[PDB]
């Protein structure tokens, strides 16, 4: 029963179900959220720190490079996986486990990758979010050793091996379906959903592909046979000359190019929270905007803002009197 950072981040009160509670020091020291760090100073101390000897770390590394998840995991993820492997070897027999995992089989459908299936609130034709379902809607819910991991890539390699995994729920998980990003230039898959440039060839070419992993150790990938996905419509357009200085914003062609620092002021990037106990004392219902700073005059916007504007193809017609920032 090893605990990842996702157990403490999601406030898993699961010290009672397990007895071999083992954690690394780097999984507990890298957490920056104040609430769970306060929780760790209050929680009963039955966990104990344990460091793995590196032969298990070596072996976890060579099949991490074979399962296709080595760029997806981090080093502390490798440490946690080696920790649960070495305890499964120490307490349980090792011969239960198969190495050199199986081949993935391909089964594609006509569904778009952006179809909103497996979202709790959405319902096609009943699917209701009720007060009795809030604690249960986490993910697809399904003896002595276990894991408390929410990251998918560790689960993918772990069920490729064959260790039983559990979550902050009680009963163990047999099936794990999720999404990965696949490059259609170099065919390298990433489990990091946040990134937009692939690690191998560096192009902005990752596309969503769904994956399902069984407890037996079978990975299978659903592609989309939809021509809308692989359509080169708004991909070629004239780019301006590269410009430098303190105010230039380049069209973001690579993952590691140096942008000038253009940050919003702290008054600009405060959103009002309405459930604060001292909110009603305020003179206004909303946070006052920023109209006086230099970042307001330079029309600096948040990174998450204006996403659908970027998704329109540049070789199209905007409205006559507008300018796209």
Partner 1 sequence: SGALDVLQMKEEDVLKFLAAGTHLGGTNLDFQMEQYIYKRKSDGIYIINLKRTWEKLLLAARAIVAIENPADVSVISSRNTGQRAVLKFAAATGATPIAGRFTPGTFTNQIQAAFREPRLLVVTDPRADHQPLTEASYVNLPTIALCNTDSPLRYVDIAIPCNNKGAHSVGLMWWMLAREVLRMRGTISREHPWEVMPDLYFYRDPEEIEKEEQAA
Partner 2 sequence: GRVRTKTVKKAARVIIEKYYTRLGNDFHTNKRVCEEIAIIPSKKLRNKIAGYVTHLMKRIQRGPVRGISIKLQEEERERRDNYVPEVSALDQEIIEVDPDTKEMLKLLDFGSLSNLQVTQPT
Annotated binding residues, as ranges? 183, 186, 198, 201
Residue 223 in contact with partner 2, rule: CB under 8 A: yes
The upper half-sphere exposure of residue 25, i.e. CA atoms within 13 Å in the direction of its Cβ, equals 4
Contacts with partner 1, residue ranges (CB under 8 A) = 54, 57-58, 60-61, 70, 73-75, 78-79, 184-186, 197, 199-205, 230-232, 235-237, 239, 241-244, 250, 253-258
Instruction: Pick what 61 binds: Zn ion, partner 1, partner 2, none; C-beta below 5 to 8 Å, kind-dependent.
Output: partner 1
Closest CA to 179 of 266, 275, 115: 115
The position carrying tokens 């995992």 is 101
Q: Which is nearer to Zn ion, 23 or 190 (CB)?
A: 190
Least Cβ distance, residue 192 to Zn ion (angstroms): 14
Give the number of residues written for the chain: 325
* Listed residue (143, 208, 214, 141) closest to 181, CA to CA: 208
Range 199-238, binding Zn ion (CB under 5 A): 200-201
C-alpha separations of 47 from 199, 209, 301 in Å:
36, 38, 44
Q: Which residue has the tokens 């301006």?
A: 240
**Least gap, CB of 231 to partner 2 (angstroms):** 12
- The answer to whether 108 contacts partner 2 (rule: CB under 8 A) is yes
How far is the CA of 27 from the CAs of 191, 243, 263, in angstroms? Answer: 20, 42, 30
Q: Is 196 in the site for Zn ion (CB under 5 A)?
A: no
181 binds Zn ion (CB under 5 A): no
Decide which of partner 2, Zn ion, partner 1, none touches 295; Cβ closer than 5 to 8 Å per partner kind. Answer: none
Token pair recorded at residue 62: 């060579």
| Residue 258, both tokens | 């140096």
Q: Which of 89, 119, 141, 186 binds partner 2 (CB under 8 A)?
A: 186
Phi, psi of 159 (to 5 degrees): -75, -20
DSSP structural state of residue 216: S
Please tell me whether residue 37 binds partner 2 under the rule CB under 8 A: no
Nearer to partner 2, 200 or 325 (CB): 200
Tokens 């249960």 belong to which residue? 136
Binding site partner of 54, from Zn ion, partner 1, partner 2, none, Cβ cut-off 5-8 A by kind: partner 1
132, burial (CB in 10 Å: exposed 0-12, middle 13-18, buried 19+): exposed
Binding site for partner 2 (CB under 8 A): 106, 108, 184-187, 223, 225, 230
Binding site for Zn ion (CB under 5 A): 183, 185-186, 198, 200-201
């Amino acid at each position: 029963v090893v605990a990842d950072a996702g157990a403490f981040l999601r406030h898993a009160a699961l010290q009672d179900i397990g007895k071999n509670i083992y954690t690394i020091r780097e999984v507990v020291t890298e957490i920056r959220d104040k609430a769970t760090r306060r929780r760790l100073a209050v929680l009963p101390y039955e966990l104990r720190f344990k460091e793995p000897l590196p032969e298990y770390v070596r072996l976890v590394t060579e099949f991490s490079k074979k399962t296709g998840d080595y760029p997806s995991l981090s080093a502390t993820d490798i440490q946690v996986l080696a920790l649960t492997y070495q305890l499964e070897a120490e307490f349980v027999g090792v011969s239960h486990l198969k190495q050199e995992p199986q081949k993935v089989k391909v089964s594609s459908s006509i569904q778009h990758p952006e179809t909103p299936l497996h979202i709790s609130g959405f319902h096609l034709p009943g699917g209701w979010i009720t007060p009795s379902n809030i604690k249960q809607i986490q993910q697809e819910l399904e003896v002595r050793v276990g894991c408390l991991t929410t990251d998918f890539a560790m689960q993918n390699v772990l069920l490729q091996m064959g260790l039983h995994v559990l979550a902050v729920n009680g009963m163990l998980i047999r099936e794990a379906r999720s999404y990965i990003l696949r490059c259609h230039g170099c065919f390298k898959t990433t489990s990091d959903m946040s990134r937009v440039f692939c690690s191998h060839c560096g192009n902005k070419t990752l596309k969503k592909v769904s994956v399902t992993v069984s407890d037996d150790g079978t990975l299978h990938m659903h592609f989309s046979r939809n021509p809308k996905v692989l359509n080169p419509r708004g991909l070629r357009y004239s780019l301006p000359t590269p410009k430098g200085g303190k105010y230039a914003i380049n069209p973001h062609l690579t993952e590691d190019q140096r942008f000038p620092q253009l940050r919003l002021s702290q008054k600009a990037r405060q959103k009002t929270n309405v459930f604060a106990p001292d909110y009603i004392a305020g003179v206004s219902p909303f946070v006052e905007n920023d109209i006086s700073s230099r970042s307001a005059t330079l029309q600096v916007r948040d990174s998450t803002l204006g996403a659908g504007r970027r998704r329109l193809n540049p070789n199209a017609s905007r409205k006559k009197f507008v300018k796209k920032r």
